[PDB]
Write a protein that binds this DNA or RNA. Structure first.
Ligand SMILES: [Mg+2]
Ligand SMILES: [Mg+2]
Ligand SMILES: [Mg+2]
Ligand SMILES: [Mg+2]
Ligand SMILES: [Mg+2]
Ligand SMILES: [Mg+2]
Ligand SMILES: [Mg+2]
Ligand SMILES: [Mg+2]
Ligand SMILES: [Mg+2]
Ligand SMILES: [Mg+2]
Ligand SMILES: [Mg+2]
Ligand SMILES: [Mg+2]
Ligand SMILES: [Mg+2]
Ligand SMILES: [Mg+2]
Ligand SMILES: [Mg+2]
Ligand SMILES: [Mg+2]
Ligand SMILES: [Mg+2]
Ligand SMILES: [Mg+2]
Ligand SMILES: [Mg+2]
Ligand SMILES: [Mg+2]
Ligand SMILES: [Mg+2]
Ligand SMILES: [Mg+2]
Ligand SMILES: [Mg+2]
Ligand SMILES: [Mg+2]
Ligand SMILES: [Mg+2]
Ligand SMILES: [Mg+2]
Ligand SMILES: [Mg+2]
Ligand SMILES: [Mg+2]
Ligand SMILES: [Mg+2]
Ligand SMILES: [Mg+2]
Ligand SMILES: [Mg+2]
Ligand SMILES: [Mg+2]
Ligand SMILES: [Mg+2]
Ligand SMILES: [Zn+2]
Lengths: 155, 50, 123, 91, 51, 105, 51
RNA sequence: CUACACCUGAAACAAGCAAGAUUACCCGCUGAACUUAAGCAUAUCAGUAAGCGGAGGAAAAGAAACUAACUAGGAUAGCCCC
RNA sequence: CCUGAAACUAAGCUCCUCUCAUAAGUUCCUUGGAACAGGACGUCAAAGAGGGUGACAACCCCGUAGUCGGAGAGGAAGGCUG
RNA sequence: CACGGGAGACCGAUAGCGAACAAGUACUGCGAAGGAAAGAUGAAAAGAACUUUGAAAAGAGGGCUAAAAGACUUGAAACCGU
RNA sequence: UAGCAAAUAUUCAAAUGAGAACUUUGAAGACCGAAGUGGAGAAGGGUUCCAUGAGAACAGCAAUUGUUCAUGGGUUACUCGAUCCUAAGACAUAGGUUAACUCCUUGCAAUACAAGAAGACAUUCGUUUUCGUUGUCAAAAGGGAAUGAGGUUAAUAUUCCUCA
RNA sequence: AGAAAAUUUUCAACGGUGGAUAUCUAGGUUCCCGUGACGAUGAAGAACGCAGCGAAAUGCGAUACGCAAUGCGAAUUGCAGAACCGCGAGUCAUCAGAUCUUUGAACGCAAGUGGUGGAGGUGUAAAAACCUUCAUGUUUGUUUCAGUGUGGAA
């Protein structure tokens, strides 16, 4: 302990030899994730990649000014959309039952989002039969074959 | 006794006595004495032991 | 003096195969007695030949006997352990597919009335 | 005298061959084997304690009659009751 | 790349090895206690030592 | 920090463990038979021997079992003057004589 | 001495057989490096474990 | 009191289950000193070694008796930050 | 406003295992025990990764590439969709 | 950790796992446990025919082979003989 | 070079061999002197035993010789011993303790206890009857059913052969 | 100029000791990826065996360096003898059916012992000898039972 330099802060005081983490897998891992994602697309083909996410304000005073992707839609919101949680789920919508709406505007955003979703939707029933709730769209839509990303369609 | 019987059934002879050895090499020597009826030399001859 | 062919063996009866077995064995003993007294290379080879032979014969006999017992027990569970599947202790000890997938009532209902649909978004 | 003249007095043997591990580790007075512990009925070895042991006695150390084929038939799906079939399709 | 690290330790560290102590007219380095092998008494783990 | 001999005497694996190979039997009384509480049972001194740990001789006493055909042997403590082949009386009514066994009252 | 277990007898027999020299014709094989049997043993200089 | 029923315990028998192995990773326990404090008790090494009991392909964890007080967020797990 | 165990009835795909096959100089000189060397003339190349052949060989042999290609056999602790 | 795959500005026979090899082996310890040394003839055995002197090892002739490279590639130093 | 000096001792001729102070026969001289340098065992050794052969190495000189090397061959039991019995002891089972591992009790048998044995008919069961609390291991000098003489092999023999 | 040798000594060449250097590698080491897949259907480990000529290592288990099936389609090879040209060679591979001695969680009891019980099979005039079978815990049941446990008709 010699010079003016700042008081050291011990690091290797314990036996770290047992406790080191190595990052070489990272290389391959990224790749794996890619293929996973891709193989999801292929197996999900007619449907979108990421399920529908509502939006909210962030949880901190400093973050309030910003916008964040929620985990799920408020039952209140599904009501104003006219969807049952169960149905919305069969649709690819993400629902969260512990979240609550304390503002008109927070209802608004998500209604707008839901409606936007539905309008742009295509629904395949058991072949050539048609249905009612959230309804069901014409057989010709089967030919329309849309592979789409949610940010493009519902931003 | 197993040896007496087996030796009779196999060689058509009457075995008067059987005695047993365990060699260190790990085998069982059997010293077999035939009754007065048979002649060892003969059984030897038929077996190809001469 | 010829090699023994398996199919040829599977052609015969059990009696036949047995009688032959006994013969073969007697052969062997005679032959080892060859080695011991005096012997020709012919006899030496004879040995290995007959040994392998006897093995083969036995093999067949068991194939047959086996397929027979398996036959009797065909159709029943509670076969002798000999015949029951041997894979891994863990394998047999495990649940069935019936049981893997098997589902509670409420579940079959949701699966009917809600389920998952094919959708597409357009942009 | 603790030395050479003392060594003459050793004709006793405290151990005999352990049925389980077969060395002369068996203690007739204590009725156990210092190596495996044959009566104990589960193998005596302390791994963290000291490190070389498993490579002396341990899994894979002597031939494994059953397990070696487990590797191979692991991939083959554990076939039971199957026979190989000709690619020539003889009937 | 790196040198073997295993249950036993970094390679070359694989003995129970002592320092004979000053009395023996030998160097203080760690040796291998034991009997019956030519490796016995041979210098133990350290840069200086073969093995 | 050693262990004194004082302490080493309570060890049962230890060196101090009685040498029992000579012991003949515990020296005790008869079992408390009905006979003894309400009456008297009589036995013989088949012998008075020496137990290797004992200063006092032991008396070997034959009794007839009340409930069966067996003859019961028992070992009592020698009362000075007791003879081999003596009749010893144990119980309620047994009278006062050297070597008889009564209640103290 | 005289008195022996079976186990003993068998073990001794084993080591007795294993104590033969490399058969003179094995040295003529194409794939072998073996001039001699390195594992031979002499009762006087080295002792077995049987108890 | 008997037959009989039920509660409780017992023997033999039928069909199935556990007993050991594995070590890198995982779970539940148990648990020190060398070492650092330039001495040394608290402390540190450290819930670390050794020891014991359990698994699996992963284990564990998980649908709030959570955060936060903001125009709030919302199972568990890993990465980055803090 | 929706759904479908039973029964009846068509066509299919996925994954795994074991096998079988594929370009183009062995032309000429010189030095060599050996040419796989240095020269002269040639070729294939979605193949000039790497090996083996008496030597630092694309072209002699195994391979490599076209090949998430083609052909044959058997599979699902008894795969999946009408 | 086990069986598999592929790879590397790793190591290259006192290095690299202790073990390139009948290596957790030989060997030691009553025992718990300890634990080494040891890889390269040649393209091909063509591994030295035969003569001679020797009781024999072996020497001298003679020969294989590109070369003895002959228990074996190269063959440094210390040490030793001429 | 130090050194190969304890334990009284060797010598002669022949033979064998390339070679003999160190091998074999014979002839002499001495030693252990039945508290042996003799004849057999236990522990320990494990083939060191027997025969034939023999280059190197080893047998601290030597060797034609070997406890060494190579090849083959040798260990026979109703009566010997183990095996059975109990001892000093010890370990299961049962019950209890431990995080667990482990640990505590048990012949005078239990810190346990609905634990056994026998008979007969039956001859399976069953039937039936009788009496009943419940384990094992530890002695090659202790206890302990019965064999001897003669002969034989290169090497075994109270074992094989003969006789009793 | 004890102007020779021997000794002591410098240098070189050759020879001897010795195994450095150079060049290699069916090895190690580390990284990434794939599967976790042992066992009372007796595992991991241990013992003893198994080749015409075999000790070890590796394989195997009285069917013993191996049977069967399948794919490769002619060798093994150190010696000797056979087998095979496709009725098919092989120390080849694949591996899905068999063999699997004595053991070991290890199992009737016991054990430094191939010792010794019960039941069944066999054998005999009766025996001996041989063979198969019996561990503990637990979840159901089946059968037979005990309890001055609770009820209780004729
Ligand atoms: Mg991963
Ligand atoms: Mg091994
Ligand atoms: Mg192995
Ligand atoms: Mg000094
Ligand atoms: Mg005790
Ligand atoms: Mg002995
Ligand atoms: Mg000695
Ligand atoms: Mg020794
Ligand atoms: Mg009940
Ligand atoms: Mg376990
Ligand atoms: Mg430290
Ligand atoms: Mg200090
Ligand atoms: Mg802390
Ligand atoms: Mg597992
Ligand atoms: Mg030329
Ligand atoms: Mg060219
Ligand atoms: Mg090339
Ligand atoms: Mg290709
Ligand atoms: Mg010459
Ligand atoms: Mg040269
Ligand atoms: Mg010089
Ligand atoms: Mg001296
Ligand atoms: Mg003497
Ligand atoms: Mg003597
Ligand atoms: Mg003698
Ligand atoms: Mg006792
Ligand atoms: Mg006790
Ligand atoms: Mg007697
Ligand atoms: Mg007699
Ligand atoms: Mg030189
Ligand atoms: Mg074939
Ligand atoms: Mg039971
Ligand atoms: Mg009652
Ligand atoms: Zn053991």
């Amino acid at each position: 302990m010699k010079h003016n330099n700042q008081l050291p802060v011990a690091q290797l005081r314990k036996h770290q030899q047992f406790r080191i983490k190595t990052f070489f897998n990272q290389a391959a891992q990224k790749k794996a994730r890619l293929h996973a994602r891709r193989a999801q697309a292929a197996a999900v083909f007619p449907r979108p990649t990421e399920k529908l996410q509502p939006v909210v304000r962030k949880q901190t005073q400093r973050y309030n000014k910003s916008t964040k992707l929620g985990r799920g839609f408020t039952l209140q919101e599904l009501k104003a959309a006219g969807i049952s949680a169960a149905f919305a789920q069969s649709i690819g919508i993400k629902v969260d039952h512990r979240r609550k709406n304390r503002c008109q505007e927070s209802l608004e955003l998500n209604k707008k989002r839901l409606l936007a979703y539905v309008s742009k939707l295509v629904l395949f029933p058991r072949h050539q039969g048609k249905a009612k709730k959230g309804l069901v769209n014409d057989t010709a839509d089967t030919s329309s074959a849309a592979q789409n990303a949610l940010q493009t369609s519902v931003p | 006794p197993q040896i007496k019987s087996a030796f009779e059934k196999l060689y058509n002879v009457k075995v008067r006595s059987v005695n047993t050895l365990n060699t260190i090499t790990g085998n069982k020597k059997a010293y077999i004495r035939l009754a007065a009826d048979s002649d060892s030399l003969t059984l030897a001859n038929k077996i190809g032991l001469i | 003096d010829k090699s023994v062919r398996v199919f040829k063996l599977r052609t015969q009866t059990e009696e036949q195969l047995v009688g032959e077995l006994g013969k073969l064995q007697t052969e062997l003993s005679q032959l080892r007695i060859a080695k011991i007294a005096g012997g020709t290379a012919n006899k030496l080879g004879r040995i290995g030949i007959v040994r392998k032979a006897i093995a083969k014969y036995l093999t067949i006999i068991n194939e047959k006997r086996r397929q027979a017992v398996k036959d009797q027990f065909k159709g029943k569970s509670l076969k002798p352990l000999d015949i029951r599947v041997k894979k891994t202790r863990a394998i047999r000890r495990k649940l069935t597919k019936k049981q893997r997938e098997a589902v509670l009532v409420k579940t079959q209902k949701k699966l009917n009335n809600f389920g998952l649909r094919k959708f597409a978004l357009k942009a | 005298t603790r030395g050479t003249p003392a060594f003459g007095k050793r004709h006793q043997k405290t151990h005999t061959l352990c049925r389980r591990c077969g060395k002369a580790t068996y203690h007739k007075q204590k009725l156990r084997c210092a190596a495996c512990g044959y009566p104990d009925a589960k193998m005596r070895r302390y791994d963290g304690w000291g490190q070389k042991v498993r490579d002396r006695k341990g899994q894979g150390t002597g031939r494994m009659r059953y397990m070696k084929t487990i590797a191979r038939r692991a991939k083959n799906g554990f076939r039971s009751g199957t026979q190989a079939a000709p690619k020539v399709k003889a009937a | 790349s790196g040198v073997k690290i295993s249950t036993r330790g970094t390679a070359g560290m694989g003995h129970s090895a002592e320092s004979w102590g000053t009395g023996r007219a030998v160097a203080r380095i760690p040796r291998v206690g034991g009997s019956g092998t030519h490796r016995s008494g041979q210098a133990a783990f350290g840069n200086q030592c073969r093995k | 920090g050693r262990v004194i001999r004082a302490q080493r005497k309570g060890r049962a694996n230890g060196v101090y463990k009685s040498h029992k190979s000579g012991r003949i039997a515990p020296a005790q009384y008869r079992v408390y038979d009905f006979a003894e509480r309400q009456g008297y049972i009589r036995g013989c001194i088949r012998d008075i021997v020496h137990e290797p740990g004992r200063g006092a001789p032991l008396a070997e006493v034959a009794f007839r079992d009340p409930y069966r055909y067996k003859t019961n042997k028992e070992h009592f403590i020698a009362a000075e003057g007791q003879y081999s082949g003596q009749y010893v009386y144990c119980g309620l009514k047994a009278q006062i004589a050297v070597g008889n066994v009564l209640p103290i009252n | 001495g005289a008195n022996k277990t079976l186990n003993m007898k068998k073990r001794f027999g084993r080591k007795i057989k294993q104590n033969r020299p490399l058969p003179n014709w094995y040295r003529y094989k194409s794939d072998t490096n073996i001039r001699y049997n390195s594992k031979r043993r002499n009762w006087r200089r080295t002792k077995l474990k049987i108890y």
